[PDB]
């Protein structure tokens, strides 16, 4: 049938990478992964996660007593202070996790966008955008031509006189 | 003659909360809040004194249950619930200020 | 080797938050009142 890109849905057949390609020509179909965009997305998330596994050096000692209870007026100032600080660290934990979930989702959504305008400026006038995340190449691009878009070695002037006859005239 | 671009997906993901939405399906997630512990006082590399039947302030006055702790030395003092400070009945004055001194004293 | 103790054992983890004891002493993770806070390590899931 037909193939669609990242605008419609995500592929469940991509297992060796986060972002990848999927071509369709006369030789058949094909699916590859993108190692430079997957590694760039993971390097920002474990760097984000390296910020959270660093432990404090401030040692807190014991001021209450679980066996022999402290005096009641000093036992209520300690209890009121500890619940005040607990509200702060329960707010800051729930705020930080919810904020870094917005940043994680948005950074992986901008790596797929950055891969999209990289291919779009490679295929300068030889391809048109479908609207679902795919490019309609207007020349006979075989299996090593499709490899040249994948590894950033495409030359648009090799097919420029051929793909322009198929766009404005045919 | 076409070439597509897509991202990966799984059948069932994990639901996390975001700033404007609750229960967003992400691909993977992890837990940030610890709930499981080790039910022992794991103290390798330290000098641990386990008082037991003896109380922390008893080692100053020396009841019979605190005979082996009169000149103790520790990097970590463990107080137990069954520890008593006195043999003849009585109690200390400002006992909790003295307990915070000997907990920090090192011996 | 432990560094954060409370009345029922020792907390040994790389997680930055914990929900075991308020009165844990030593060099401890920060006590929160929530028991689950899931952090996204992947992208948003859009299935086929």
């Amino acid at each position, epitope marked *: 049938g037909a193939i669609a890109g990242f605008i419609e849905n995500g592929w469940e057949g991509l297992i*060796d990478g986060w972002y990848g390609f999927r071509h369709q020509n006369a030789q058949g179909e094909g699916t590859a992964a993108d190692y430079k965009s997957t590694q760039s997305a993971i390097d920002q*998330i474990t760097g984000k996660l390296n910020r959270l*596994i660093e432990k404090t050096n401030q040692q807190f000692e014991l001021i209450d007593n679980e066996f022999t209870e402290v005096e009641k007026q000093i036992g209520n100032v300690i209890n009121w202070t500890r619940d005040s600080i607990t509200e702060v660290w329960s707010y800051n934990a729930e705020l930080l996790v919810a904020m870094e979930n917005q940043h994680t989702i948005d950074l992986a959504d901008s790596e797929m966008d950055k891969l999209y305008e990289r291919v779009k400026r490679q295929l300068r006038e030889n391809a048109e955008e479908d609207g679902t995340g795919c490019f309609e190449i207007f020349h006979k691009c075989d299996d090593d031509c499709m490899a040249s878009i994948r590894n950033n070695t495409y030359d648009h002037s090799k097919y420029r006189e051929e793909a322009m006859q198929n766009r404005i005239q045919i | 003659d076409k070439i597509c671009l897509g991202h990966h997906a799984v059948s069932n993901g994990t639901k996390v909360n975001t700033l404007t939405e609750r229960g967003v399906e992400v691909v993977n997630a992890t837990e940030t809040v610890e709930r499981t512990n080790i039910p022992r006082i794991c103290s390798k590399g330290k000098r641990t004194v386990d008082l037991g039947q003896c109380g922390l302030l008893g080692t100053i006055t020396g009841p019979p249950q605190c005979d082996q702790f009169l000149e103790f030395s520790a990097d970590l003092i463990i107080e137990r619930r069954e520890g008593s400070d006195v043999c003849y009945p009585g109690k200390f004055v400002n006992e909790e200020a003295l307990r915070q001194i000997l907990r920090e004293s090192g011996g | 080797e432990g560094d954060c103790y409370y009345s029922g054992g020792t907390i040994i983890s*790389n997680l930055p938050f914990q929900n075991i004891d308020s009165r844990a002493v030593g060099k401890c993770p920060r006590y929160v009142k929530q028991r689950s806070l899931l*952090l996204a390590t992947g992208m948003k899931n859009v299935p086929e």
Partner: antibody
Amino acid sequence: QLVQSGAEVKKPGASVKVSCKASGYTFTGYYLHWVRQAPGQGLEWMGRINPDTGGTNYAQKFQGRVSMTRDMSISTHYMELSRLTSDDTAVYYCATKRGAVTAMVYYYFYGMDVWGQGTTVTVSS
Amino acid sequence: DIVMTQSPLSLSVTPGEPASISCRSSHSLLHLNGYNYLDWYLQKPGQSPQLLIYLGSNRASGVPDRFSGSGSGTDFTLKISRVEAEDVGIYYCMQALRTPPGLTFGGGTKVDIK
């Protein structure tokens, strides 16, 4: 694959500079590590450099007297260790990540996979 | 300050009987992404070190199926299903959890034919 420079004999107080030409790398955004092995003793991690930016992370033992640079046009890394002593007599390895591996778990690996042949450095009189 | 402690510090083996090298950590090596940052290395006499296991359990490229890795948290074991004559040398464990502390190696474990 990595190819280092030859052996060097130095005097206490001078500075040694080792080369490491990463030949065949199309990513050049991994981490390259320099480690050290004295004769008889074990391996000893010195530092780590990012070929994209140049951000280094030395050990606390080798802090102050280690400078690591690179020249990405010729794809060659350097390591300069100043104020040499007799205990700097060792073999100096440069190592990095292999690349072109089709596993998902290999993206979370930031250590040493492919290694250099070693550089013997002798400091005596 | 993560300190790696290896054992049994030497291991005379027989070519056909399994072996096991353990390396226990001081702090937990389990990251937030769910991986244990422990690497197993083999250095033969006169050669560069060879990577065997790279994330606690995952075998490298040119490593046979004799070498296995297990363990999580602080306690880790390298496991050889059967020993050949090409498996002698010194085995190092290496942690890579946090880089501003740094990467550190184990003490080593000499393995010779008995």
